[PDB]
Design an enzyme around this catalytic site. Structure first.
Site, mmCIF file in Angstrom:
data_model
loop_
_atom_site.group_PDB
_atom_site.id
_atom_site.type_symbol
_atom_site.label_atom_id
_atom_site.label_comp_id
_atom_site.label_asym_id
_atom_site.label_seq_id
_atom_site.Cartn_x
_atom_site.Cartn_y
_atom_site.Cartn_z
ATOM 1 N N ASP A 1 1.202 2.083 -2.999
ATOM 2 C CA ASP A 1 1.980 1.301 -1.879
ATOM 3 C C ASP A 1 1.653 2.028 -0.479
ATOM 4 O O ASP A 1 2.539 2.115 0.210
ATOM 5 C CB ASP A 1 3.312 1.416 -2.428
ATOM 6 C CG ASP A 1 3.691 0.587 -3.555
ATOM 7 O OD1 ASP A 1 3.198 -0.211 -3.888
ATOM 8 O OD2 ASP A 1 4.724 1.190 -4.344
ATOM 9 N N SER B 1 2.637 4.262 4.603
ATOM 10 C CA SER B 1 3.437 3.870 3.590
ATOM 11 C C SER B 1 3.855 2.610 3.664
ATOM 12 O O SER B 1 4.233 2.227 5.063
ATOM 13 C CB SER B 1 4.436 4.926 3.057
ATOM 14 O OG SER B 1 5.233 4.377 2.029
ATOM 15 N N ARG B 2 4.191 1.529 2.781
ATOM 16 C CA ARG B 2 4.508 0.340 3.175
ATOM 17 C C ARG B 2 5.885 0.263 2.902
ATOM 18 O O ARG B 2 6.462 -0.444 3.866
ATOM 19 C CB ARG B 2 3.825 -0.424 2.117
ATOM 20 C CG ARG B 2 2.345 -0.733 2.146
ATOM 21 C CD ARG B 2 2.020 -1.866 1.075
ATOM 22 N NE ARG B 2 0.397 -1.958 1.294
ATOM 23 C CZ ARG B 2 -0.273 -3.217 0.741
ATOM 24 N NH1 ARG B 2 0.407 -3.853 -0.085
ATOM 25 N NH2 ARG B 2 -1.584 -3.134 0.829
ATOM 26 N N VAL B 3 6.630 0.637 1.925
ATOM 27 C CA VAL B 3 8.227 0.438 1.987
ATOM 28 C C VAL B 3 9.012 1.742 2.195
ATOM 29 O O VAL B 3 9.970 1.641 1.655
ATOM 30 C CB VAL B 3 8.514 -0.071 0.800
ATOM 31 C CG1 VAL B 3 7.828 -1.715 0.594
ATOM 32 C CG2 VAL B 3 8.151 0.443 -0.653
#
Ligand code: ATP
Lengths: 505, 89, 56, 473, 50
Positions: A345, A370-372
Site C-alpha cells: 500500500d 503511503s496510499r491510505v
C-alpha cells in the site's frame, strides 16, 4: 536439575504413543538428491502434508504423482539416506500459536532455539491459510505511531496498512522497523489492548550473530515481553526460509483473530525469493524473468494478503506488515521489487546517498509515499503537516535548482533556508523513538519559520533543548496532545507562545 | 515396557548418584563439588566485581557547599562589574 | 508550578533585551534549566528503588 | 571391519557413479576411496540416485578409470587432521601433507561438514578485535569473530599486509592463523610459502604460527568447493579446543563461488542467475555461519574478494557483501605515496564504526579523522591548482593535519624488517586513540610532517621529533 | 540470576554427557535379547487393539 529429567520422563511416558503407533503412512525413499526426495508409497498422504523422515528431519510433500511423491526437505540432505522409512504426521504443515510465544525465539516450525524450554502454545495453525475476503475487512482508521520523525510526519501507517520499506545494503533499513518496535513499548507498558500492538520480527537468511545482537538489543530496551523472533538464518535450508514468513503470518493471524492488534516485519522478502527460485530450479521448473519462476509474484502476494484490518464483526483485529526489499544499486525496476510495489500500500524508499551523507533516516520523500495513511494519521499531525510535504517538495524543487550558485529572490532563498532547517531537522539517532506529543512542536516550529534564524548546525541541540524546555515547563500541553491527538485553536495559540518563548533563544 | 522401564531407571539412577546422594560422580575423574558450589559459588562475583559492586557501596554523598558564605568582597565587585556591563549595555 | 517562574523568565528575557551582555544571569537560567532537566529525568528514570522480594 | 565395496558404473569428467550392494548405502557428503596406482582418489557422495547407486564428484583427476572397480567407503565425511601438528604444514583438501615433510602425526581427525554453532551459542555483542595495525584499529575496526572484505590486486604488499596481521595476532592475542588458498596460483603459492618461511611465521624447526591449506588451481571443482571447508574445520578446532581467537584467511571467495557453480553445473542442476549455482545463498551460508564468536572463543575471517568485471550488482559480490562486517581496501595510490600499509582511509568501512561499539571517544576521533581527510581530498584539486593561498587558517591547519595523519598512518612492519630494516611495532588501541586525538587537537603542529612517516605511536612521534631536531642540529 | 541460568545450562550439558554415559550403559546388555520379547508382546498389544 532432576526436574528437567522429570519433565523429560513425562515426555518419555508420551514417547503411550508407541502403544498406539500404527502409522498409516510409512514408505521407502526412492531417491534423494539436490534438496528433494522421491518417496514410494504413502497412498493416503494429503497434499502439502507434513511428513517426517527416519533421521528426524521433517519435510513437506509438495507434488503428488501416480507412483511416487516428491517431498522437499527441511534441512540438509546429509541426514536423509536412501531407502529409509518416511512417517507422515497426518497434518498439513502447522505451527504453534499462542501468547507464550512472546519472548521466545523459534525456528520456522515453532521449535524454540532460545533454549528456554518448551512453548506454551494455544494451538496449531496451518501455514497456507486463505487470506480473508473483502467483506470481513475495514479501511484503516487507527494510527501506527512508529516514533520516527519523518515516518510519522509524512508516511503515516494504519493498523493493517501494508507498507513497504525498500532500500539497499547497509542503508538503515532494519533500524527503522526496529525503532518502531521500540516505540511500541509506550503502549505495551500500558493496559488498553487496542492501544497495545504486538511485534513479530522475521529474520530470514541472515547472520546468526546479527539476530543474536538484535535479540540482545530488544532485551536491553525490554521489547522482548511483546516480541516474537522467527529465525531462518542463511545456514539453514532454503525451504525453511521459504516457509517461515507464512508461519509468522499465521501467528499474526492468531493475534488478529483474537481481536488484538499486531505487527509483523519481514526481513527480507528478497532472500525468500532467492530460496524460492532455488526450490523451483531444483524442482526442474522453468524460470522466467531474471531466472525466477513466474509464480514468485503469487508467492509474496499470497503471503502479504494475510494482513489487514478486521471489521467490528470480526472483533476489529488488525495485522500490519513491514516487508523489506534489498535492491541492487538503487534500482526500482528489477523484477522482484516491482512485484512487491504492485502489492503493498505504499513505499518507504531509503536513498543510499542520504545515509552516505550521514542523514539517518535516509528517507527520499519524493519516492516514499503511503496510499491510505492519511485516513489514519494522528489528527494533530494531520493538522500540522498539511503544508509540510508541500514545502518539502518545494524545497526539493529548489534543491537541484540551487546547485548552480546563482543568487535568487527572498522567496526561493527563504524556502531554501527553511528546507535546509527541515532537512537537518528530521535526522534521528537509532534507538531514539519520539512520541507524538514530542513530534508535534518540532513540526510547529519547522512550519512557522522559527528555525530560520537558528544556525543549521544548532538544530540538533535545539531539538533536545526545546523538548526538555517543554517537558520542564509546558508539560500540560504535552498531556493535551497525548489526550486529544488534536490541537484546538487555544492549544494552537498556547503552543505558539510556548514555541516563540524558546525561539527567543 | 522393559525397554522403557530399564532405560528410564538407568536414566534416573546413574545421575542419582550425582544429585540425590552426594557420592560425587563415579564415572567422572574430576570432582563435581569444588566447581559450582565452591569455586564458582563466587562465580557471578567472579563475573562481577567483589567488595564494591556486590557489597554495593552504600556511599555518603560528597557534600558540595554554597559560595563559601562570603557576600561582601565578591558582591561589591559584582556590583562594580555590573556598572561596567551597564556601561557596555 | 515552575511554568509561572519560566513565564517570568521569558518576560525577563524580553526585558533583558534592554540589557544586552548579561554575563551570567542568562547563564543562571541556563544552569537552572540544566539541573531541572537533570532532576526531572532523574525522577522519571527512577524506579521504586528496591529489590522485589516477592518476584525478583 | 565392514568393507562397503562399491562398483564404478559411470565416469563423466569429474562425475562418478557407484552401484553398491544392498543396504550398504553411505549418506550424502561422505568420503569414498579408490586405490589408484598413483595414490588414492577421493569421492564425495552428493546425490543418491536410487537403485543402490549414488553420484559423487571427484577430488582429483579421473583418468584411466575402469568402471566396475572396488570402491571403498569411509562412512563419515572427509576427516582432516587437526592440532599442533598442523602448524606449518602444507595440506591438500584431502588432509594429506604435501610439503613432503612426512605424515602429519595429528591425534584427532575431524569431519569437514560440521554444523554451524547454534543461535544460543552466538556471542550477543561483537567486541573489536584489536589487530595491532593503526589504520585498521582506527578506521575499519574488525569484529572479534567477524568478516573482512579485503580488496586490491597483488603487488601492493597484500601478502606483506596479511603476514603482518599474522604476527600482530600472534603477539597480541596469541591465537593462530589458518591460510587457505582456494584456486591459488601454484607458483605464487610457492613464493608465499617460501616468504612465510623467510619472514619467520613458519619456522620449519621451531613453532610455525600458522597452518596452510592450498587447493591448487589444477584440482577439479569438487576439491575447490571444499578447500574452504577444510580450512574452516581446522580453524574451528583451534577455536573450540584451545579457546582462542583464530584467524582464517581465505583467497579467493570468488574462486570458491566459481567452484560451487561449476559443481552444481556438473551435477546437471539448472543454473540460476548470472550463471551462478542456484544454491548460492545456501552455499554461502554454510560457509559463513560456521564462522562466528562462541563463548569458547572466536574465529575471525579475513578473505579477499575479487570484484568480477567491476560490478557490484553481480550476485557473488552482492552475496558476499551480505556477510562482510568490515571492508579493507589496499589501493595503489596509497602504496604510490610510499605508505606501508597501502590502506585507503576513505573506503575501508565497518558496520562496527559506532559510538555504542567502540565507545564515544574512538567514534568521535574516527569521525573527525574521516571528516578531515574528506575535506582534504576535496581540497586536493585547488591545492595543486591554486596553492596554499586559498587556504584560510581554518583550512591550511586541516591540510597540514591531514598531511600529518597521512604520514602518521604509515606503520613499520615486523615482516618488512628484512625489507626496510625498521622494526615493526605492535601498536596498541589505547595508544592509537590518544595519538590520533592529540593530532586532532593540534598539540604537535610544530612537529614537522616528516617526523610521522612510518612511526609506531605518539611516544615514537616525540622520539622521532627529537631525533630529527637533533639531526637538523 | 544470570549465573543461576548459566548453572542450569551447565547442569543440562553435564547431564547430556551423562546421557552418553547412560547410552554406553544400555549398549552391552541382554536387554538386546530380552527386549525382542518386549516388541513381541507389544506388537501383540497393538494389533490386538484392532
Ligand atoms: N538513526 C540512526 N542512528 C544511528 N545509526 C544508524 C541510524 N540509521 C542507520 N544507522 C546505521 O546504519 C547501519 C545499517 O543499519 P541497518 O542494518 O538498519 O541497515 P540495513 O540496510 O538494514 O542493513 P541490512 O539490510 O544489512 O540489515 C547501522 O550500522 C546503523 O549504525
Amino acid at each position: 536439575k532432576a526436574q528437567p529429567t522429570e519433565v523429560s520422563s513425562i515426555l518419555e511416558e508420551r514417547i503411550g504413543v508407541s502403544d498406539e503407533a500404527n502409522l498409516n503412512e510409512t514408505g521407502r525413499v526412492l531417491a534423494v538428491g539436490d534438496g528433494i526426495a522421491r518417496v514410494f508409497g504413502l497412498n493416503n498422504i494429503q497434499a502439502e502434508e507434513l511428513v517426517e523422515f527416519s533421521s528426524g528431519v521433517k519435510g513437506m510433500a509438495l507434488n503428488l504423482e501416480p507412483g511416487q511423491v516428491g517431498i522437499v526437505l527441511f534441512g540438509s540432505d546429509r541426514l536423509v539416506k536412501e531407502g529409509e522409512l518416511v512417517k507422515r504426521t497426518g497434518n498439513i504443515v502447522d505451527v504453534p500459536v499462542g501468547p507464550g510465544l512472546l519472548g521466545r525465539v523459534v525456528d520456522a516450525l515453532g521449535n524454540p532455539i532460545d533454549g528456554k524450554g518448551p512453548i506454551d502454545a494455544a494451538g496449531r495453525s496451518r501455514a497456507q491459510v486463505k487470506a480473508p475476503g473483502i467483506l470481513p475487512r475495514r479501511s484503516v482508521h487507527e494510527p501506527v505511531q512508529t516514533g520516527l520523525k519523518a515516518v510519522d510526519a509524512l508516511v503515516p501507517i494504519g493498523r493493517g496498512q501494508r507498507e513497504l520499506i525498500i532500500g539497499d545494503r547497509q542503508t538503515g533499513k532494519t533500524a527503522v522497523a526496529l525503532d518502531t518496535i521500540l516505540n511500541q513499548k509506550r503502549w505495551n507498558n500500558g493496559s488498553d489492548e487496542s492501544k497495545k500492538l504486538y511485534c513479530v520480527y522475521v529474520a530470514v537468511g541472515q547472520k546468526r550473530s546479527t539476530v543474536a545482537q538484535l535479540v540482545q538489543t530488544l532485551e536491553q530496551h525490554d521489547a522482548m515481553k511483546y516480541s516474537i523472533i522467527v529465525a531462518a538464518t542463511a545456514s539453514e535450508a532454503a525451504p525453511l526460509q521459504y516457509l517461515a514468513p507464512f508461519t509468522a503470518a499465521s501467528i499474526g493471524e492468531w493475534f488478529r483473530d483474537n481481536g488484538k492488534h499486531a505487527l509483523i516485519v519481514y526481513d527480507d522478502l528478497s532472500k525468500q525469493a532467492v530460496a524460492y527460485r532455488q526450490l523451483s530450479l531444483l524442482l526442474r521448473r522453468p524460470p522466467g524473468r531474471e531466472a525466477y519462476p513466474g509464480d514468485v509474484f503469487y508467492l509474496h502476494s499470497r503471503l502479504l494478503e494475510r494482513a489487514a484490518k478486521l471489521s467490528e464483526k470480526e472483533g476489529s483485529g488488525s495485522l500490519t506488515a513491514l516487508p523489506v526489499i534489498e535492491t541492487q544499486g538503487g534500482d526500482v525496476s528489477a523484477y522482484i521489487p516491482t512485484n512487491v510495489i504492485s502489492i503493498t500500500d505504499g513505499q518507504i524508499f531509503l536513498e543510499a546517498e542520504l545515509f552516505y551523507k550521514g542523514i539517518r533516516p535516509a528517507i527520499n520523500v519524493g519516492l516514499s509515499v503511503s496510499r491510505v495513511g492519511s485516513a489514519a494519521q494522528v489528527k494533530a499531525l494531520k493538522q500540522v503537516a498539511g503544508s509540510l510535504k508541500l514545502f518539502l517538495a518545494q524545497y526539493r524543487e529548489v534543491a537541484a535548482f540551487a546547485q548552480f550558485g546563482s543568487d535568487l529572490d527572498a522567496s526561493t532563498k527563504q524556502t531554501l533556508v527553511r528546507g535546509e532547517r527541515l532537512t537537518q531537522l528530521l535526522k534521528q539517532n537509532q534507538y531514539s523513538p519520539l512520541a507524538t506529543e514530542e513530534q508535534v512542536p518540532l513540526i510547529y516550529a519547522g512550519v512557522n519559520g522559527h528555525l530560520d534564524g537558528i544556525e543549521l548546525s544548532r538544530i540538533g541541540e535545539f531539538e533536545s533543548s526545546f523538548l526538555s524546555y517543554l517537558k520542564s515547563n509546558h508539560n500540560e500541553l504535552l498531556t493535551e496532545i497525548r489526550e486529544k491527538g488534536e490541537l484546538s485553536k487555544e492549544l494552537l495559540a498556547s503552543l505558539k507562545s510556548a514555541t516563540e518563548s524558546f525561539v527567543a533563544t | 515396557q522393559d525397554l522403557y522401564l530399564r532405560e528410564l531407571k538407568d536414566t534416573k539412577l546413574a545421575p542419582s548418584t550425582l544429585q540425590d546422594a552426594e557420592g560425587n560422580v563415579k564415572p567422572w575423574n574430576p570432582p563435581q563439588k569444588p566447581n559450582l558450589p565452591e569455586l564458582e559459588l563466587q562465580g557471578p562475583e567472579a563475573l562481577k566485581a567483589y567488595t564494591e559492586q556486590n557489597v554495593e557501596t552504600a556511599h555518603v554523598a560528597k557534600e558540595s557547599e554554597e559560595g563559601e558564605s562570603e557576600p561582601i568582597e565578591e558582591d561589591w565587585l559584582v556590583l562594580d562589574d555590573a556598572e561596567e556591563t551597564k556601561e557596555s549595555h | 508550578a515552575k511554568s509561572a517562574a519560566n513565564k517570568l523568565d521569558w518576560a525577563k528575557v524580553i526585558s533583558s533585551l534592554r540589557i544586552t551582555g548579561s554575563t551570567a544571569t542568562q547563564l543562571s537560567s541556563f544552569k537552572k534549566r540544566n539541573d531541572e532537566a537533570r532532576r526531572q529525568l532523574l525522577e522519571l528514570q527512577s524506579q521504586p528503588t528496591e529489590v522485589d522480594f516477592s518476584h525478583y | 571391519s565392514t568393507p562397503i565395496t562399491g562398483k564404478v558404473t559411470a565416469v563423466i569428467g569429474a562425475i562418478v557413479d557407484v552401484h553398491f550392494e544392498q543396504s550398504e548405502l553411505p549418506a550424502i557428503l561422505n568420503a569414498l576411496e579408490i586405490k589408484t596406482p598413483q595414490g588414492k582418489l577421493v569421492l564425495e557422495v552428493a546425490q543418491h540416485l536410487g537403485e543402490n547407486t549414488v553420484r559423487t564428484i571427484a577430488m582429483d583427476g579421473t583418468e584411466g578409470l575402469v568402471r566396475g572397480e572396488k570402491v571403498l567407503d569411509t562412512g563419515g565425511p572427509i576427516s582432516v587432521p587437526v592440532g599442533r601438528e598442523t602448524l606449518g604444514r602444507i595440506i591438500n583438501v584431502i588432509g594429506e601433507p604435501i610439503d613432503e615433510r612426512g605424515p602429519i602425526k595429528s591425534k584427532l581427525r575431524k569431519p569437514i561438514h560440521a554444523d554451524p554453532p547454534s543461535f544460543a551459542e552466538q556471542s550477543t555483542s561483537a567486541e573489536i578485535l584489536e589487530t595491532g595495525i593503526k589504520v585498521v584499529d582506527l578506521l575499519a575496526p574488525y569484529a572479534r569473530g567477524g568478516k573482512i572484505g579485503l580488496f586490491g590486486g597483488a603487488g601492493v604488499g597484500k601478502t606483506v599486509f596479511i603476514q603482518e596481521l599474522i604476527n600482530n595476532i600472534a603477539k597480541a592475542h596469541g591465537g593462530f592463523s589458518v591460510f587457505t588458498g582456494v584456486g591459488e596460483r601454484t607458483r605464487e603459492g610457492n613464493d608465499l610459502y617460501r616468504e612465510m618461511k623467510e619472514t619467520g611465521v613458519i619456522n620449519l624447526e621451531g613453532e610455525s604460527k600458522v597452518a596452510l591449506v592450498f587447493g591448487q588451481m589444477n584440482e577439479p571443482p569438487g576439491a575447490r568447493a571444499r578447500v574452504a571447508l577444510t580450512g574452516l574445520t581446522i580453524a574451528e578446532y583451534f577455536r573450540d579446543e584451545e579457546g582462542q581467537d583464530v584467524l582464517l584467511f581465505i583467497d579467493n571467495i570468488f574462486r570458491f563461488t566459481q567452484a560451487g557453480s561449476e559443481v552444481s553445473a556438473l551435477l546437471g542442476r539448472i543454473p540460476s542467475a548470472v550463471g551462478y549455482q542456484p544454491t548460492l545463498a545456501t552455499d554461502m551460508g554454510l560457509l559463513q555461519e560456521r564462522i562466528t564468536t562462541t563463548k569458547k572463543g572466536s574465529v575471525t575471517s579475513v578473505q579477499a574478494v575479487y570484484v568480477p568485471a567491476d560490478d557490484l550488482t553481480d550476485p557473488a559480490p552482492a552475496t558476499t557483501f551480505a556477510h562482510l562486517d568490515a571492508t579493507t581496501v589496499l589501493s595503489r595510490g596509497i602504496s604510490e605515496l610510499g605508505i606501508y600499509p597501502a590502506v585507503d582511509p576513505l573506503d575501508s568501512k565497518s558496520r562496527l564504526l559506532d559510538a555504542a561499539v567502540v565507545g564515544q571517544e574512538h567514534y568521535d576521533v574516527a569521525s573527525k579523522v574521516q571528516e578531515t581527510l574528506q575535506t582534504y581530498k576535496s581540497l586536493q584539486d585547488i591545492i595543486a591548482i591554486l596553492g596554499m593561498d586559498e587556504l584560510s587558517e581554518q583550512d591550511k591547519l586541516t591540510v597540514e593535519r591531514a598531511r600529518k595523519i597521512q604520514r602518521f598512518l604509515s606503520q613499520p612492519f615486523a615482516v618488512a624488517e628484512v625489507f626496510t630494516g625498521i622494526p615493526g611495532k605492535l601498536v596498541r588501541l589505547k595508544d592509537t586513540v590518544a595519538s590520533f586525538k592529540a593530532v586532532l587537537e593540534g598539540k604537535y603542529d610544530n612537529i614537522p610532517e616528516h617526523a610521522f612517516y612510518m612511526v609506531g605511536g605518539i611516544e615514537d612521534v616525540v622520539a622521532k621529533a627529537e631525533k630529527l631536531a637533533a639531526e637538523a642540529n | 540470576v544470570r549465573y543461576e541460568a548459566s548453572l542450569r545450562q551447565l547442569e543440562q550439558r553435564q547431564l547430556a554427557k551423562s546421557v552418553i554415559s547412560r547410552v554406553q550403559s544400555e549398549l552391552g546388555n541382554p536387554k538386546f535379547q530380552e527386549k525382542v520379547l518386549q516388541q513381541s508382546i507389544s506388537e501383540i498389544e497393538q494389533l490386538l487393539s484392532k
